[PDB]
Amino acid sequence: ITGRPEWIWLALGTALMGLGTLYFLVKGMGVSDPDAKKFYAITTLVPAIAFTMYLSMLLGYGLTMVPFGGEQNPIYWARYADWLFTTPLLLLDLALLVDADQGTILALVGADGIMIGTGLVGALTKVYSYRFVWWAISTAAMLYILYVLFFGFTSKAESMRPEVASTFKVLRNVTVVLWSAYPVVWLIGSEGAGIVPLNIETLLFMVLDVSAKVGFGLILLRSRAIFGEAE
Amino acid sequence: ITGRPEWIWLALGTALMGLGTLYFLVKGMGVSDPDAKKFYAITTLVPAIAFTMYLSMLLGYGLTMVPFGGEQNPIYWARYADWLFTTPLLLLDLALLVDADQGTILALVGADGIMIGTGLVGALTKVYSYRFVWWAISTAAMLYILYVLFFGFTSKAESMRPEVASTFKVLRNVTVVLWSAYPVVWLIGSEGAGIVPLNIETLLFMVLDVSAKVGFGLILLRSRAIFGEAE
Amino acid sequence: ITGRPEWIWLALGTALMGLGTLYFLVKGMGVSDPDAKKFYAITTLVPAIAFTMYLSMLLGYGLTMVPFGGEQNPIYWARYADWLFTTPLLLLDLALLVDADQGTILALVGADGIMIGTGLVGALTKVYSYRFVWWAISTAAMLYILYVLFFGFTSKAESMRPEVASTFKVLRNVTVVLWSAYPVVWLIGSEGAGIVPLNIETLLFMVLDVSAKVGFGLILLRSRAIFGEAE
Ligand SMILES: CC(C)CCC[C@@H](C)CCC[C@@H](C)CCC[C@@H](C)CCOC[C@@H](CO)OCC[C@H](C)CCC[C@H](C)CCC[C@H](C)CCCC(C)C
Ligand SMILES: CC(C)CCC[C@@H](C)CCC[C@@H](C)CCC[C@@H](C)CCOC[C@@H](CO)OCC[C@H](C)CCC[C@H](C)CCC[C@H](C)CCCC(C)C
Ligand SMILES: CC(C)CCC[C@@H](C)CCC[C@@H](C)CCC[C@@H](C)CCOC[C@@H](CO)OCC[C@H](C)CCC[C@H](C)CCC[C@H](C)CCCC(C)C
Ligand SMILES: *C/C=C(C)/C=C/C=C(C)/C=C/C1=C(C)CCCC1(C)C
Ligand SMILES: *C/C=C(C)/C=C/C=C(C)/C=C/C1=C(C)CCCC1(C)C
Ligand SMILES: *C/C=C(C)/C=C/C=C(C)/C=C/C1=C(C)CCCC1(C)C
Ligand SMILES: CCCCCCCCCCCCCCC
Ligand SMILES: CCCCCCCCCCCCCCC
Ligand SMILES: CCCCCCCCCCCCCCC
Ligand SMILES: CCCCCCCCCCCCCCC
Ligand SMILES: CCCCCCCCCCCCCCC
Ligand SMILES: CCCCCCCCCCCCCCC
Ligand SMILES: CCCCCCCCCCCCCC
Ligand SMILES: CCCCCCCCCCCCCC
Ligand SMILES: CCCCCCCCCCCCC
Ligand SMILES: CCCCCCCCCCCCC
Ligand SMILES: CCCCCCCCCCCCC
Ligand SMILES: CCCCCCCCCCC
Ligand SMILES: CCCCCCCCCCC
Ligand SMILES: CCCCCCCCCCC
Ligand SMILES: CCCCCCCCCC
Ligand SMILES: CCCCCCCCCC
Ligand SMILES: CCCCCCCCCC
Ligand SMILES: CCCCCCCCC
Ligand SMILES: CCCCCCCCC
Ligand SMILES: CCCCCCCCC
Ligand SMILES: CCCCCCCC
Ligand SMILES: CCCCCCCC
Ligand SMILES: CCCCCCCC
Ligand SMILES: CCCCCCCC
Ligand SMILES: CCCCCCCC
Ligand SMILES: CCCCCCCC
Ligand SMILES: CCCCCCCC
């Protein structure tokens, strides 16, 4: 484990995702509202999945070597197995908050799968220049997601209860800022141009992951928007 | 790329799926009917997924070598990753058109997963004679799907609006004819008996894919069956 | 095939899953109740999936070698591909029986995916002591599932029709007893401590699989709880 300088950030990430999972699990014990139960189930699964994948990276299972640039490059593939399941769950939290229609939910989840799937292909591609073709396709899929979150959901939240509109607006802004950083870290990190070393890259993804999952969840599960209007 | 004679058909397929995706995306911009939005989302995702997998084959990522018959045989595995997601989406288009019940939808999607999954196992199997055992199981799963589309959905469409009944009947006939060709191309192509060479096999799958996805989508999204009855 | 002593139990399992699939398929022909159709579709898919994965193990495709303990250990990875899809389908049978809320269904299916996913990682892990870390995480996920089936569903079934309450109680008890045996067989078998040899381990999993899928299905599909109350 300790033979890799980035191990400290993988261990911290593992701990923070595990602690986040347990807090949400305990906090959700005393909840019977069927609407609130939906948000607790979605939001608790997110850091639980991330916990297992951070642990796999810490123990060395989620790491492979990819030859490109005449070098064997360490690629943590477990990140994409994490994101494949956690990013659509996070979008479902937002879509259920605004009572989005089914067709829009399917478009979001499908574009998200394309985003993560093409990012994985780009991470494992051995022809250096082709890695950035996949990065560009994946980034186009992300821009579609961000467009929908702004010019489809925002207008839908305003016609909703005030507390669900204000909570959505906050979580929307958090998501757009944090998610946009991921393609940048990829491009300048060891998967892309190799400007930033792997140990610093790992620290950046850990800050982003914890903020986008545990920070996101703390804002959502403390809001009254997750409960139905009741007397 | 150009070192493979089949590259021209992979490049054409990539272009036609990309163009198809963009047309459906633009055409769906001016749509607010929640029913129509469902069909546009399903139908636009189909060629978008196929685009990415054709590109992976063009660039050489979606290709592996499988030893059988005393030879290293080029097997494009990316086809099955495509079909795993696009064939159930196409069946969902048909099932939603006739307002099929949930139990029937699950049976269709499950049989479809078995069809594609066993076809993938057959494509990667190293014992030559066993490849055709998997082909037979996969073909049995397809025949179940075709039976349901005829002796379960057809009777359901007649009790529906006339425009949804006539549109379903057309898309049903297109699907049964085109899908039935796939097991035949597999059997006589490089995955099976090896009668037809890979470059011709690739041309045939490209014609079938574009017809079953973009041609299918053009018929559906030009129909009024996708809109609810409104004044 | 016959070069492996466990082949006899893989062949028996294949036959019993295939026969089970055909019986459920025939029995479900004469069913039009939309509620009953749901249970028949879920319950017939379970042994059909298991059939294909037992066949892959029989023919040698679903087997790999994992080095640990200074030895190349035969690991049947196809079991986890089976369980990944069949265990959530079995939980869906139970959840639909008691009309569970959506949030609870998602929590069950998500915990089940974590259970199977971490068990697969543990089966393929090359550092011997780490294999049991994954076993423990997977077992914690199972205990969560069992808790929900007892202290969330049981109370919900009592407020239901008497026949659905008594049928659920029976299937609940069958599930908790049979599922609990799996982590024990893993721990003492070739994936874990290696006390029980592989051929005996394979026999035990076959008895458990057939009971948990075909036996489970025979109890459910003979009950009147799967039909709506009708005159
Ligand atoms: C509606 C939305 C959900 C739609 C989703 C969008 C999606 C279509 C976007 C594209 C996804 C696609 C790129 C997934 C590729 C997975 C692949 C990286 C797995 C590893 O295989 C890659 C190479 C080794 O580098 O295999 C070496 C050769 C091996 C012999 C490969 C044989 C196994 C194949 C991988 C079998 C295909 C399985 C499916 C891809 C499983 C789904 C994986 C997940 C990442 C989507
Ligand atoms: C309700 C419906 C959706 C049900 C679906 C029906 C489905 C059950 C039908 C059978 C599907 C099954 C054959 C999928 C097999 C995937 C497999 C080809 C992936 C590549 O692995 C094959 C060998 C190399 O040749 O791995 C070499 C050895 C490696 C060490 C393998 C270890 C990884 C395992 C593959 C882990 C299992 C992952 C799941 C199979 C992922 C789903 C893939 C998709 C193709 C279903
Ligand atoms: C809501 C719920 C459904 C959530 C589900 C819970 C889930 C997150 C729990 C953890 C699942 C995770 C451990 C799955 C790992 C699959 C992995 C074993 C496949 C084989 O790859 C392992 C190594 C060889 O030993 O690959 C060698 C290196 C290769 C180069 C690997 C590159 C391919 C990657 C495997 C791509 C990721 C694909 C996804 C993991 C596909 C889903 C598989 C299924 C088992 C979940
Ligand atoms: C909890 C994890 C989250 C919210 C991860 C989000 C990840 C992304 C938005 C990743 C995007 C990428 C691109 C847009 C292209 C480059 C490759 C990716 C996958 C890093
Ligand atoms: C857009 C792609 C489509 C509609 C693909 C359809 C593919 C099939 C219907 C494939 C069927 C197969 C068999 C029936 C057995 C032989 C292997 C397959 C997977 C080619
Ligand atoms: C039809 C198959 C069924 C119902 C299989 C159930 C399997 C389990 C409940 C497996 C559980 C495991 C653990 C709890 C940890 C050890 C590894 C597993 C996956 C065997
Ligand atoms: C979206 C965030 C990207 C900003 C990356 C900042 C990295 C600064 C760290 C110093 C770079 C290390 C280079 C010298 C080793
Ligand atoms: C009462 C609110 C705080 C509860 C404690 C939460 C502990 C989980 C770890 C959170 C750290 C990361 C927060 C986002 C920066
Ligand atoms: C379902 C369509 C299958 C028909 C295949 C027709 C192939 C004819 C092309 C000529 C065969 C090439 C053999 C000589 C190289
Ligand atoms: C107005 C209808 C035609 C629009 C142009 C569609 C261009 C997408 C490519 C379609 C070619 C394949 C059609 C099926 C044979
Ligand atoms: C949950 C069931 C686990 C019980 C396992 C009993 C196995 C007894 C078979 C004899 C053990 C073989 C050891 C000598 C070869
Ligand atoms: C009339 C009920 C029996 C029908 C025959 C079922 C045959 C399928 C194989 C069942 C054997 C396994 C039963 C569970 C132990
Ligand atoms: C194995 C991959 C299957 C999933 C394909 C994605 C489409 C799923 C459609 C689900 C239809 C709704 C069923 C109720
Ligand atoms: C990782 C594979 C999980 C999918 C298994 C297929 C069954 C899914 C059941 C979904 C139940 C409906 C939830 C609302
Ligand atoms: C185009 C939709 C408007 C909202 C999206 C904001 C774009 C942020 C740019 C992200 C940069 C990634 C490289
Ligand atoms: C048996 C259901 C009737 C409709 C299915 C038509 C069968 C077409 C044969 C396809 C040939 C594939 C080898
Ligand atoms: C803790 C929830 C109560 C019901 C679960 C029964 C636990 C059975 C123990 C299984 C042993 C697996 C190692
Ligand atoms: C080795 C660098 C080659 C540059 C390729 C950049 C491709 C980016 C595509 C974005 C449209
Ligand atoms: C090398 C050819 C061996 C023939 C096997 C055919 C199997 C087909 C099974 C269809 C029932
Ligand atoms: C080689 C045996 C090492 C023992 C590790 C046991 C780990 C079990 C963790 C359960 C909390
Ligand atoms: C609940 C605390 C979980 C912390 C265990 C993971 C941290 C790795 C320490 C080496
Ligand atoms: C929108 C046009 C997309 C065409 C790019 C793919 C074709 C491959 C050319 C080499
Ligand atoms: C319907 C009977 C299915 C039996 C075939 C599988 C058994 C393997 C025999 C070698
Ligand atoms: C993106 C930063 C999240 C901050 C988490 C703190 C929330 C406390 C209510
Ligand atoms: C299967 C052939 C499809 C033909 C596509 C043309 C549709 C234009 C309306
Ligand atoms: C767990 C044992 C199941 C027994 C199956 C027999 C059911 C006949 C109704
Ligand atoms: C009005 C809410 C502002 C939230 C933005 C937070 C950016 C990290
Ligand atoms: C909408 C604000 C985008 C912020 C992008 C930050 C990328 C590091
Ligand atoms: C009555 C519609 C006929 C459609 C069949 C088209 C076959 C390619
Ligand atoms: C229902 C007509 C089937 C046509 C099969 C064509 C196979 C090449
Ligand atoms: C295995 C075939 C079953 C025969 C019919 C059983 C009575 C519905
Ligand atoms: C009251 C029903 C008892 C069922 C338990 C069966 C254990 C195999
Ligand atoms: C609730 C009874 C548990 C039985 C466990 C059996 C494990 C072999």
Please answer whether residues C154 and C172 qualify as being in contact, where contact means their C-beta atoms are separated by less than 8 angstroms: yes
Q: Return the SS3 of C190.
A: coil
Sequence-ordered alpha helix ranges (H) in A59-195: 78-97, 102-124, 128-150, 154-158, 162-188
Please answer whether residues C3 and C10 qualify as being in contact, where contact means their C-beta atoms are separated by less than 8 angstroms: no
Q: Which helix (H) or strand (E) holds C74?
A: strand C71-76
Other Cβ atoms less than 10 A from the Cβ of C180: the count is: 13
CATH code of residue A145: 1.20.1070.10
Give the closest-approach CA distance of B186 to chain C in angstroms: 20
Q: Report the distance separating Cα A74 and Cα A67, nearest Å.
A: 9
Tokens read off for C62? 């679903």
Which residues in chain C are closer than 8 Å to B98, comparing Cβ atoms? none
Structure letter (DSSP) for residue A212:
I
Residue B215, amino acid:
G
Please answer whether residues C176 and C142 qualify as being in contact, where contact means their C-beta atoms are separated by less than 8 angstroms: no
Please answer whether residues B186 and B119 qualify as being in contact, where contact means their C-beta atoms are separated by less than 8 angstroms: yes
The two beta strands, A71-76 and A63-68, are: antiparallel
Instruction: Give me the DSSP letters along B126-143.
Output: SSHHHHHHHHHHHHHHHH
Sequence-ordered alpha helix ranges (H) in chain C: 7-27, 34-58, 78-97, 102-124, 128-150, 154-158, 162-188, 198-210, 216-221
Tokens read off for A169? 């607006």
Instruction: Please list, in sequence order, all residues whose beta carbon lies within 8 angstroms of the beta carbon of residue B81, skipping any fewer than 6 positions away.
Output: B53, B62
Ligand 11 neighbours (beta carbon < 6 A): C 181, 184-185, 196-197, 200
Q: What is the number of CB-based contacts under 8 A between chain A and chain B?
A: 46
Q: Return the SS3 of A137.
A: helix
Q: Report the distance separating Cα C152 and Cα C169, nearest Å.
A: 13
Identify how the structure was determined.
Answer: X-ray
Contact B52 A125 (CB under 8 A): no
Q: Return the SS3 of B192.
A: coil
Q: Report the distance separating Cα A92 and Cα A107, nearest Å.
A: 12
Of C37, C55, C61, the CB nearest to B104: C37
Q: Which helix (H) or strand (E) holds B116?
A: helix B102-124
Which residues in chain A are closer than 8 Å to C133, comparing Cβ atoms? 55, 59
Listed by number, the residues of chain C in 103-142 with a beta carbon closer than 8 Å to a beta carbon of chain B are none
> Is the CB of residue B89 below 6 angstroms from any atom belonging to ligand 13?
yes
How far is residue C61 from each of residues B71, B125, C53, C216, measured CA to CA in Å?
19, 7, 9, 28
Give the closest-approach CA distance of B94 to chain A in angstroms: 15
CA B117 to chain centre: 14
Instruction: Please list, in sequence order, all residues whose beta carbon lies within 8 angstroms of the beta carbon of residue C103, skipping any fewer than 6 positions away.
Output: A34, A36, A37, A38, A39, A40, A41, A42
Answer left, alpha or beta for residue C70, where phi above 0 means left and psi between -120 and 50 means alpha: left
Sign of CA dihedral C28, C31, C35, C36: negative
Tokens read off for A47? 């850091």
What are chain C's partners, defined as 3 or more CB pairs within 8 angstroms?
Answer: A, B
Of B36, B40, B52, the CB nearest to A114: B52
**Residue of C33, C55, C86 to mutate when probing chain B, most B C-beta within 10 A:** C55
Classify residue C125 as exposed, middle or buried by CB count within 10 Å of its CB (0-12, 13-18, 19+).
buried
Give the closest-approach CA distance of A73 to chain B in angstroms: 18
Domain that residue B32 falls in: 1-231
Please answer whether residues C62 and B126 qualify as being in contact, where contact means their C-beta atoms are separated by less than 8 angstroms: no
Scan for tokens 């990309």, then name that residue: B18
Atom 4 of ligand 9, nearest CA residue: B185
Instruction: Please list, in sequence order, all residues whose beta carbon lies within 8 angstroms of the beta carbon of residue A98, skipping any fewer than 6 positions away.
Output: A153, A156, A157, A160, A164, A168
Q: Report the distance separating Cα A89 and Cα A91, nearest Å.
A: 5
Number of Cα atoms under 13 Å in the Cβ half of residue A1: 13
Q: How many domains does chain C have?
A: 1
Residues A144, A150, A151, A153: what is their CA dihedral angle, to the nearest 10 degrees? 110
Please answer whether residues C228 and C33 qualify as being in contact, where contact means their C-beta atoms are separated by less than 8 angstroms: yes
Contact A107 B61 (CB under 8 A): no
Sign of CA dihedral B109, B110, B111, B115: positive
Residue B224, amino acid:
R
> Is the CB of residue A176 below 6 angstroms from any atom belonging to ligand 28?
yes
- Greatest alpha-carbon pair distance for chain C in Å reads 67
Q: Report the distance separating Cα A92 and Cα A104, nearest Å.
A: 11
Answer left, alpha or beta for residue A69, where phi above 0 means left and psi between -120 and 50 means alpha: left
Other Cβ atoms less than 10 A from the Cβ of A155: the count is: 10
Tokens read off for C123? 């089966």
Bridge partner residues of C71 (DSSP): C68
Q: Return the SS3 of B60.
A: coil
Other Cβ atoms less than 10 A from the Cβ of B156: the count is: 17
Tokens read off for B32? 């607010």
Please answer whether residues B145 and C77 qualify as being in contact, where contact means their C-beta atoms are separated by less than 8 angstroms: no
Contact C42 B125 (CB under 8 A): no
Classify residue C151 as exposed, middle or buried by CB count within 10 Å of its CB (0-12, 13-18, 19+).
exposed
Which residues in chain B are closer than 8 Å to C54, comparing Cβ atoms? none
Tokens read off for A191? 């998967």
Residue B210: closest CA among B6, B7, B21, B4: B21
Bridge partner residues of B63 (DSSP): B76
C222 — phi, psi (to 5°)?
A: -95, -5
